Design an enzyme around this catalytic site. Structure first.
Site, short mmCIF file in Angstrom:
data_model
loop_
_atom_site.label_atom_id
_atom_site.label_comp_id
_atom_site.label_asym_id
_atom_site.label_seq_id
_atom_site.Cartn_x
_atom_site.Cartn_y
_atom_site.Cartn_z
N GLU A 197 19.64 30.23 26.83
CA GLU A 197 18.33 30.40 26.90
C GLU A 197 17.65 30.04 25.33
OE1 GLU A 197 16.41 33.68 28.58
OE2 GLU A 197 14.52 33.62 27.40
N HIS A 223 14.04 29.96 25.05
CA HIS A 223 12.69 30.37 25.34
C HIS A 223 11.64 30.28 24.11
CE1 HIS A 223 10.05 33.18 28.13
NE2 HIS A 223 9.33 32.22 27.91
N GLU A 262 15.15 29.65 31.25
CA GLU A 262 13.93 29.56 30.15
C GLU A 262 14.18 28.46 29.09
OE1 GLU A 262 12.98 33.91 30.07
OE2 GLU A 262 11.09 33.12 30.96
N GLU A 322 13.41 35.07 39.81
CA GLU A 322 12.83 36.24 39.31
C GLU A 322 11.46 36.76 39.94
OE1 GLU A 322 12.64 36.33 35.01
OE2 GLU A 322 14.37 35.17 34.53
N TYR A 323 11.37 37.57 40.58
CA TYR A 323 10.00 38.01 41.07
C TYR A 323 9.89 39.64 41.01
CZ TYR A 323 11.89 40.14 45.57
OH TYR A 323 12.53 40.65 46.52
N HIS A 381 8.29 42.06 39.17
CA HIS A 381 8.31 42.63 37.64
C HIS A 381 8.34 44.01 37.84
CE1 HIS A 381 7.92 42.65 33.25
NE2 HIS A 381 9.13 41.62 33.63
C1 LIG Z 1 4.91 35.61 29.68
C2 LIG Z 1 6.02 36.02 29.18
C3 LIG Z 1 5.84 37.71 29.24
S1 LIG Z 1 7.65 35.69 29.61
C4 LIG Z 1 8.31 36.92 30.70
O1 LIG Z 1 8.93 38.16 30.06
C5 LIG Z 1 9.35 38.96 30.91
C6 LIG Z 1 9.34 40.33 30.20
O2 LIG Z 1 9.94 41.34 30.96
C7 LIG Z 1 10.70 38.46 31.32
O3 LIG Z 1 11.63 38.22 30.23
C8 LIG Z 1 10.62 37.00 32.24
O4 LIG Z 1 11.88 36.29 32.38
C9 LIG Z 1 9.62 36.16 31.32
O5 LIG Z 1 9.30 34.81 32.19
NA NA Z 2 11.94 42.45 29.63
#
Ligand SMILES: CC(C)S[C@@H]1O[C@H](CO)[C@H](O)[C@H](O)[C@H]1O
Ligand code: NA
Ligand SMILES: CC(C)S[C@@H]1O[C@H](CO)[C@H](O)[C@H](O)[C@H]1O
Ligand code: NA
Ligand code: NA
Ligand code: NA
Lengths: 211, 211
Positions: free
Chosen positions: A24, A26, A69, A145-146, A148
């Site tokens: 990763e 990111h 990412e 991922e979905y 949150h």
């Molecule tokens: C746009 C950002 C918050 S990125 C966002 O952060 C999340 C925090 O829990 C996760 O790490 C996701 O994988 C990531 O896409």
């Molecule tokens: Na997180």
């Protein structure tokens, strides 16, 4: 890649596993700066190839992932094809660079909404129902991922499941995520409490986003 | 096929035309009883071929249609291929037999709803959004008939247009329909009034469904 016992338990109890390379990047600008760079291909290749060499006999692993990412770079395409060549038995997925690149057998967006388009430049997150039927598109869609689940959350979770059940090619997803990453600290009385980003003097930090 | 002047006016004023063969066998049981029978191929073919021979030079005509509500029979397949062979410049559509058969270049259902499936046996009307992304499906979807404007109607019309604008492969449709088929009759005072099915002693009839 997980602790080796994880795959043993998934084989025996029965869970489908996406086994994912330790890659990763990111925080790069843009996100693909390292993954499109041939100088970083050797380091990246080892993270992919040594995962496959270790886990390829586990029935629980049904899908390989090129990581997380890291934008979409040429290194991703190279390693996608390495796996397809070495192990035809499992599809390869990767979300970076728009979730539907040449490095993924599965449309695997993160946080793409059910009905609502989010037309970000270059890497739009289409409504999952619309994404399936874009001109030329034929692949299955499974969100990497979905939903949150941060604090008081999972509002609109039923909307995903209705869509998954109605559309054959919407084949589900992976919730983000299983377990709060809170750490135990002790107060003056030796009483335990749950801590998050910043509670160890760690700075800069991202506070409660670890939960 | 319409009065010849119709196409001339559509050429000059500018409307896209679907030109349709004079073939409908709706009241047969099952609907394809004649269209699947080789004895009826000669009569059907002339309804198709003579239309194409008449109208093929009109720019306003952009799509040929094999007719209406006649199920799906082998005769449709034959005549589909005939047109494709004779005039490659225009798609061929036909709705009968489930709206997505081998006799149509366009998924062209009638009264399929936006979000609601109607899973009728053999001839389901899927939601138009869902239809597009069924496994293997790649064609555009244009409703040959939708939004049945019978009396106080067109409730939900906006739902169609939101979907048309959101999904590239939902390319619109043809409202049913333009003008009430009411006829003028005269009462005792010689006053004209609008008449519908049954008003001429016609029986059996389908009453106000002509409007
Ligand atoms: C746009 C950002 C918050 S990125 C966002 O952060 C999340 C925090 O829990 C996760 O790490 C996701 O994988 C990531 O896409
Ligand atoms: Na997180
Ligand atoms: C189930 C029947 C009502 S069929 C229905 O009737 C309508 C009445 O205007 C139109 O003619 C449609 O073409 C037809 O599908
Ligand atoms: Na599904
Ligand atoms: Na459209
Ligand atoms: Na009617």
């Amino acid at each position: 890649p997980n602790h080796p016992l994880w795959y043993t338990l998934c084989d025996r109890y029965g869970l489908y596993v996406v086994d994912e390379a330790n890659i990763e990047t990111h925080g790069m600008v843009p996100m693909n700066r390292l993954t499109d760079d041939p100088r970083w291909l050797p380091a990246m290749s080892e993270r992919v190839t040594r995962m496959v060499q270790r886990d390829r006999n586990h029935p629980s692993v049904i899908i390989w992932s090129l990581g997380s990412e890291s934008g979409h770079g040429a290194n991703h395409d190279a390693l996608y094809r390495w796996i397809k060549s070495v192990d035809p038995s499992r599809p390869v997925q990767y979300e970076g660079g728009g979730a539907d690149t040449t490095a993924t057998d599965i449309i695997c967006p993160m946080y793409a909404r059910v009905d609502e388009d989010q037309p970000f430049p270059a890497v739009p997150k289409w409504s999952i129902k619309k994404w399936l039927s874009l001109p030329g598109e034929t692949r299955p869609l499974i969100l990497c991922e979905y939903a949150h689940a941060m604090g008081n959350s999972l509002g609109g979770f039923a909307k995903y499941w209705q869509a998954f059940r109605q559309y054959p090619r919407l084949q589900g997803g992976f919730v983000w995520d299983w377990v709060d990453q809170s750490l135990i600290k002790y107060d003056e009385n030796g009483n335990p409490w749950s801590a998050y980003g910043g509670d160890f003097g760690d700075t800069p930090n991202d506070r409660q986003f670890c939960m």
